[PDB]
Paper text:
The second, [name](ΔLoop), lacks the entire gate loop, due to substitution of residues 615–620 by a single glycine. The X-ray diffraction data obtained for [name] crystals in the presence of erythromycin revealed electron density consistent with this antibiotic occupying the proximal pocket. The occupancy of erythromycin was estimated at 0.89 for the wild type structure, and 0.86 and 0.88 for the [name](AAA) and [name](ΔLoop) variants, respectively. The one major difference between the gate loop variant structures and the wild type is the lack of a contact between erythromycin and the central phenylalanine residue of the gate loop (Phe617). The absence of Phe617 in the gate loop variants does not lead to lower occupancy of erythromycin relative to wild type [name]. No evidence of erythromycin bound to the distal pocket was seen for the wild type [name] or either gate loop variant. The results presented here suggest that disruption or even removal of the gate loop is not enough to facilitate occupation of the distal pocket by erythromycin—at least in crystallographic soak experiments involving isolated [name].
AcrAB-TolC is the major multidrug resistance efflux pump in [name], where [name] is the efflux transporter residing in the inner membrane of the bacterium, playing an important role in capturing and expelling a range of structurally diverse substrates.
Residue numbers in the entry:
A (entry chain A): 2 to 1039
B (entry chain B), D (entry chain C): 51 to 150
C (entry chain B): 697 to 895
E (entry chain B): 548 to 597
The structure:
């Protein structure tokens, strides 16, 4: 501290080291939009080709679910059992469970469920993965010259790329928009019936003429003495072409005729599956959908993927291009880049102010060189504590520049002050003021971390979010203080120009300095007036109370957010067709969408990626937007875009189409929004539960005063078709039931049979009916079974058939059949209030219908009521700190009474714009109280100290005080408010965030300072005039 | 009894394709032998948890297992951590020509 | 590529492939027609060919209290030379023994005994070192220029050694730039000079 | 249905033999049953990471795999973290129409 | 002296470690493709005896 003033070079090395070290602690740090907020979940996926929802649910799901016991830190278990036969069991865990070991604890129960599973399931593959809900990115592939279709491309993607994107570390799941090539054998039931053959024979045959065999070795081990040739046997090898699959012999007739496969069925290189079809601006395309692994770094993973595709790019087919339809990336990149623009500029700004008030370049380089230092170094406090260069901590740098600048300033200022007052040279001035503000700087560093740590102790994911801020700020704070003892005074004595007693640069050279006179007169005027009021104190007690109360109302009557909405440069439109419609109709709709965007949004939309699939009734489109630069308007930002778009796809359709932008809060809580689970307890049947769901739905639809969008998050029961097989008749006529089953299956369901080698890559062999003979209930008639004897028996020979209901989607939560009911709270009302009303409507449902919460509103029924304790505690701590520093019980109150003066500015700021009491508004509000604290503390400090250590009177000591370190006040706040200025202006990346920070802080700051340099005195005085008895006229000691 | 293209097209490629999403993958290299043995060495990022990576692989293989030949499935598919640095190699012999 | 490097003895040295070459392997083409005709099930022709020359793990037995395996295979002498294929017959559906030369064509071909794969795809490992005089990285670079000289679909990659070095080949100067700035800053500190350190 | 000296030298001893270089193994004790159950308890040094252990232990057992039976292989061999102490025992009874 | 140091530096061989007679080494034998267990064994005996 003192030491360095005689060792400036040692200090410059401490600073240059902090800067270069913060620089290396900057190159190796995480980058993110937000931190990892989402809890770890492990998902179990499996497929049962042809199965129905109730099928998978009773064959795979409960077989897996029941084996999921003894898993550590289990939070909740939810599974979708699909009419598409797929089952997905997401097991979400307590936040910060070891991704990897949990995933191990789950797959080690899946392996006990495995051998008691279907063989179709077991061989199609069961997968366990730690993945996010949302796509890190979606990679497109198209062919510009139309030379190949969607299925061809799907093959290229799945056979030249996808296996290494899924081995890139950090890559959780890839969903493929398309499918890999397969040996597709589409059977003619007639051309089969001719020869009296069944699918089953096709199965056997395929297995037979196409296989590998363990051959062996000529001159094998062990050989006989003298043997001299050793080489391998090559036998039956897997098949290569479609031709050879025709050239398969299924049954030889009496009459010399061969019955080939070629005859009995059509054979083609085709899709393993035809559910999902993808079109990019109408042009056919196949795609890569990347979902992020649990916990891995976004921007790192994505750079690894970019490099993998760059690595593959020189070997692609003629005219085969990659497209990038959806990318969460350049937005986080450009956004944080904008926050950096602010940091650089606000520094340049603070230099501008610093010059104005000190009109001396080398002098002004002291605090301008100062802040660069504290910054660089704080990135280093984080690389030490494991945080990340994320939005919250970056807006932390932005928010902390205020405390940094204020400390550097008060230093260089008190030096200049003493030099101008007493007439001492530099060093002696340094030692003097530094000796004065050291104790002050320490007290302020600890009362400031006395407010900023309690909001660090918040719970839930929200707590991760708030602590990010709390730590970047407290640590940056300690660093500017440490700097303020090392670098700062050193530079004062080094390069601050020595000032002759009584300069005040008053009216010297005129150009730059009528300012000096004018300011001078006004700082006096100011203190004259500080006095004028310091006399009648009563009214100001009142006006203050009024201000308090106002702050309150204004506070309450302000909307509470979570985060900001962001034009993230990329969005989507989503499509839901009426339950059970067909692939082709959905495709119709999606094509409509693609057209709307390429039409009445040509200037904003660059590219559409429509995806039809998963399963026919539903489609979606990833709409990429033309660069931000060419989208100026208030209408060219996503909000109005999706607004007017949804307006299009609302009125002129047969089925509903949401058009929307993905939230910035990737995979977590909305506004006032919850996620209800209706749970079966007694075994009331999918029906009693279903009707119960409709019951809660209807009874909440009854309260528009409380709730909004009471909806199930499933599909309703659609009609399912039952072919009730007569065991007796079929065993009578000579048909084994096994055979009826597998024929009806491999016909209408299909079957994975054998594996083949296409172009050197092992793909699957799927045999199924040709389309036309398996569409209409009628075609049931077209299928026969070769009985025990040698006669074909028609399906209508052993089968009764009828229509019924079934569900396409069977959800299960924590084991039991369940149904997911989303909901939001009324326009004005709190999420929790609406949750209470739901608990109150769901308490009236039938015997055995119970309830629970998940996802977002679990995350909300967890934390709450914490803000008042943490701020009450933060207050008892701050007060206690001030009784400490000021050695009085009664004195501290004065520096506290200041809290409103910053508050009311920010609340009036939010309100008078269109903003909201969110995260940013709150961290900023904190910061503002921070500086208020600073300022006032210094004021009361000098007044007390003058009263005590130079013996002055009350009113006179305060007045002296208020006058003397006023010029710094003003310097700080201009420095800030100007540095803040950009945030509240600009549109471009992240400007929702920016503007949120900025406004609150700027407004806070105005009233803060230019109400405080008038209220702080009054505080101290009325405060002091309620302690001891000697405090005015005082004198004494020397 | 398998030949090089046998194991390459029965075991290897089915295993290689089932080896997805394993943490800190560096590079994956495999031998398919006419001696019937197939070996897939997955070398990982320096200073990764040996034990956690190796568990991740044996649990992706334990999923590729059912899409394998039954001869392979029954001889056993195995996972081990590859140093080549045996502290010791002990030999055992019989002096009076006794056993083979 | 062996040839393209054989053209540069001044840069690269002893460039060699690290595999085994295609050896002559013996192919026994089964005509499905003749065998399905005379009455032998293809399973039978196969697994007899197998358990003959290949061997087969069948059962488990318990030797001296430790479970060991049950391997059944041909005796050595009847499974050594191609002609011996003949000594093996299949019991048909009716009840007759059929020699393999009744439904098996035979020929010699080539195949490789070792199919290498690098990161998923078929690949081939070429080991190598640099000329006596030249730095390893240079020869690695000339290798990237030569494997760039090859036909469509011929790509390249690095592994093992040259991977551990293609990472840490750009780091050496930087840690010592840090070392110099930090040592100088330290001495400037100790003293009180920017210029006294230079001594 | 198998008998004790039957299971023990086929399943028990074959698994126990692979459990060396287990990090912090204190003592290893196992039971071999005619009711067909076979159980191997590994107790460890105080404070070794449980999940870390189970990962290592199932990683030595999945090596003991090639010398264990197929009925044992088919109903499932379990690897788990074990107390030897009930935290509590919850009762369920029926006062009235006394179900069994 | 500086310049001399430079030339000396560049014109000095770049290694990784030094080789150590560890009381033990190995010899490896590659027979003509498809040779026999017994012939490879001939060579191995030859070495063993050498
Ligand atoms: C923007 C981009 C994405 O937005 C969301 O994540 C939407 C808006 C979720 O709703 C909301 C719902 C919410 C808020 O619920 C608490 C939250 O969990 C998710 C992340 O977003 C939905 C419906 C998720 O379901 C939710 O998945 C959860 C694991 C729990 C719950 N369930 C299966 C039991 C279910 O509601 C689910 C599966 O991701 C949707 C599937 C179809 C996708 O993969 C699609 C393509 C998504 O990437 C997306 C639409 O593009
Ligand atoms: C650096 C820029 C800051 C420039 C600030 C210059 C002055 C600020 C504007 C005035 C705001 C405060 O307003 C202040 O209020 C009190 C009234 O209570 C006045 O003071 C007055 O109070 C009573 C009247 O009842 C008298 O005893 C007193 O002599 C009289 O002067 C001050 O003259 C006035 O300055
Ligand atoms: C100097 C001593 C203390 C001085 C502090 C005085 C003013 C400080 C400004 C704080 C006011 C913030 O405004 C209010 O704060 C809490 C969080 O803080 C919010 O509360 C919200 O966040 C947290 C979650 O992390 C939960 O407790 C709560 O369930 C939630 O809805 C309020 O809905 C918000 O409107
Ligand atoms: Ni005056």
């Amino acid at each position: 501290p003192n030491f360095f003033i005689d060792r400036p070079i040692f200090a410059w090395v401490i600073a240059i080291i902090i800067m270069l070290a913060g620089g290396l602690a900057i190159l190796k740090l995480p980058v993110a939009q937000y931190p990892t907020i989402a809890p770890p979940a492990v998902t179990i996926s499996a497929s049962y080709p042809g199965a129905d929802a109730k099928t998978v649910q009773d064959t795979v799901t409960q077989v897996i679910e029941q084996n999921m016991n003894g898993i550590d830190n289990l939070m909740y278990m939810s599974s979708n059992s699909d009419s598409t036969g797929t089952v997905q069991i997401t097991l979400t865990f307590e936040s910060g469970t070891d991704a990897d070991i949990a995933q191990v604890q789950v797959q080690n129960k899946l392996q006990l469920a495995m051998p008691l599973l279907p063989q179709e399931v077991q061989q199609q593959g069961v997968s366990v993965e730690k993945s996010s809900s949302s796509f890190l990115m979606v990679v497109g592939v198209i062919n510009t010259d139309g030379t190949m279709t969607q299925e061809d491309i799907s093959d290229y993607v799945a056979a030249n790329m996808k296996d290494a994107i899924s081995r890139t570390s950090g890559v959780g799941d890839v969903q493929l928009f398309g499918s890999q090539y397969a040996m597709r054998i589409w059977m003619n039931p007639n051309e089969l019936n001719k020869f009296q053959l069944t699918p089953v024979d096709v199965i056997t045959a395929i297995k037979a003429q196409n296989a590998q065999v363990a051959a062996g070795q000529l001159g094998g081990t062990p050989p006989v003495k003298g043997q001299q040739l050793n080489a391998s046997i090559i036998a039956q090898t897997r098949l290569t072409s479609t031709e050879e699959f025709g050239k398969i012999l299924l049954k030889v007739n009496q009459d010399g005729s061969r019955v080939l496969l070629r005859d009995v069925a059509k054979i083609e290189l085709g899709g393993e599956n035809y559910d999902i079809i993808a079109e990019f601006n109408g042009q056919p395309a196949s795609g890569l959908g990347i979902k992020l692994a649990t916990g891995a770094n976004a921007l790192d993973t994505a750079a690894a993927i970019r490099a993998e595709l760059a690595k593959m790019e020189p070997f692609f087919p003629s005219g085969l291009k990659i497209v990038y339809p959806y990318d969460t990336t350049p937005f986080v990149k450009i956004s944080i880049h904008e926050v950096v623009k602010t940091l650089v500029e606000a520094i340049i700004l603070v230099f501008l102010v610093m010059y104005l008030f000190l009109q001396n370049f080398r002098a002004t380089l002291i605090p301008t060189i100062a802040v660069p230092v504290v910054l660089l170094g704080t990135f280093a406090v984080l690389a030490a504590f494991g945080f990340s260069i994320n939005t919250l901590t970056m807006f932390g740098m932005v928010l902390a520049i205020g405390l940094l600048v204020d400390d550097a300033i008060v230093v260089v200022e008190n030096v200049e002050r003493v030099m101008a007052e007493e007439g001492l040279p530099p060093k002696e001035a340094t030692r003097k003021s530094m000796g004065q503000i050291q104790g002050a700087l320490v007290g302020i560093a600890m009362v400031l971390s006395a407010v900023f740590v309690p909001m660090a102790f918040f719970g839930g994911s929200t707590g991760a979010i708030y602590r990010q801020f709390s730590i970047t700020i407290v640590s940056a704070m300690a660093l500017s203080v440490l700097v303020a003892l090392i670098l700062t005074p050193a530079l004062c004595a080094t390069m601050l120009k020595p000032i002759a007693k009584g300069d005040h640069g008053e009216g010297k050279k005129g150009f730059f300095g009528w300012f000096n006179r004018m300011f001078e007169k006004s700082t006096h005027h100011y203190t004259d007036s500080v006095g004028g009021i310091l006399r009648s104190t009563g009214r100001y007690l009142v006006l203050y109370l009024i201000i308090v109360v106002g702050m309150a109302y204004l506070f309450v009557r302000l909307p509470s957010s979570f985060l900001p909405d962001e034009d993230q440069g990329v969005f989507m439109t989503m499509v839901q067709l009426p339950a059970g419609a067909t692939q082709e109709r959905t495709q119709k709709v999606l094509n409509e969408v693609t057209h709307y965007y390429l039409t009445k949004e040509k200037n904003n939309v660059e590219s559409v990626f429509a995806v039809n699939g998963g399963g026919q009734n539903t489609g979606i489109a990833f709409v990429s937007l033309k660069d931000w630069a060419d989208r100026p308007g208030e209408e060219n930002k996503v909000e109005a875009i999706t607004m007017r778009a949804t307006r299009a796809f609302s009125q002129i359709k047969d089925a509903m189409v949401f058009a929307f932008n993905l939230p910035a809060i990737v995979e977590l809580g909305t506004a006032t929004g919850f996620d209800f689970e209706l749970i079966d307890q007694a075994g009331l049947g999918h029906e009693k539960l279903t009707q119960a769901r409709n019951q809660l739905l209807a009874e909440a639809a009854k309260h528009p005063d409380m709730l909004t969008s009471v909806r199930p998050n499933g599909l309703e029961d659609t009609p399912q078709f039952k072919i009730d097989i007569d065991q007796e008749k079929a065993q009578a006529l000579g048909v084994s039931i096994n055979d009826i089953n597998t024929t009806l299956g491999a016909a209408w369901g299909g079957s994975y049979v054998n594996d083949f080698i296409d172009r050197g890559r092992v793909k699957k062999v799927y045999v199924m009916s040709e389309a036309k003979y398996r569409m209409l209930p009628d075609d049931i008639g077209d299928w026969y079974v070769r009985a025990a004897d040698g006669q074909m028996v028609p399906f209508s020979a052993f089968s009764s058939s009828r229509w019924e209901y079934g569900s396409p989607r069977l959800e299960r939560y924590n084991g039991l059949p369940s149904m997911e009911i989303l909901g939001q709270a009324a326009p004005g009302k709190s999420t929790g209030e609406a949750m209470e009303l739901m608990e109150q409507l769901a308490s009236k449902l039938p015997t055995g219908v119970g309830y629970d919460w998940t996802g977002m509103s679990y995350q909300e029924r967890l934390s709450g009521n914490q803000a008042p304790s943490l701020y009450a505690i933060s207050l008892i701590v701050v007060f206690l700190c001030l009784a400490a520093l000021y050695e009085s019980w009664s004195i501290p109150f004065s520096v506290m009474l200041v809290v409103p003066l910053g508050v009311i500015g920010a609340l009036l700021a939010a309100t008078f714009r269109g903003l909201t009491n969110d995260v940013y508004f709150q961290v900023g509000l904190l910061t503002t109280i921070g500086l208020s604290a600073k300022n006032a503390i210094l004021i009361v400090e000098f007044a007390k100290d003058l009263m005590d250590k130079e013996g002055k009177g009350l009113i006179e000591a305060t007045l002296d005080a208020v006058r003397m370190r006023l010029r710094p006040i003003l310097m700080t706040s201009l420095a800030f408010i100007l540095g803040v200025m950009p945030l509240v202006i600009s549109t471009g990346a992240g400007s929702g965030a920016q503007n949120a920070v900025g406004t609150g802080v700027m407004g806070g700051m105005v009233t803060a300072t230019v109400l405080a340099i008038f209220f702080v005195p009054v505080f101290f005085v009325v405060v002091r005039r309620r302690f001891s008895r000697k405090n005015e006229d005082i004198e004494h000691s020397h």
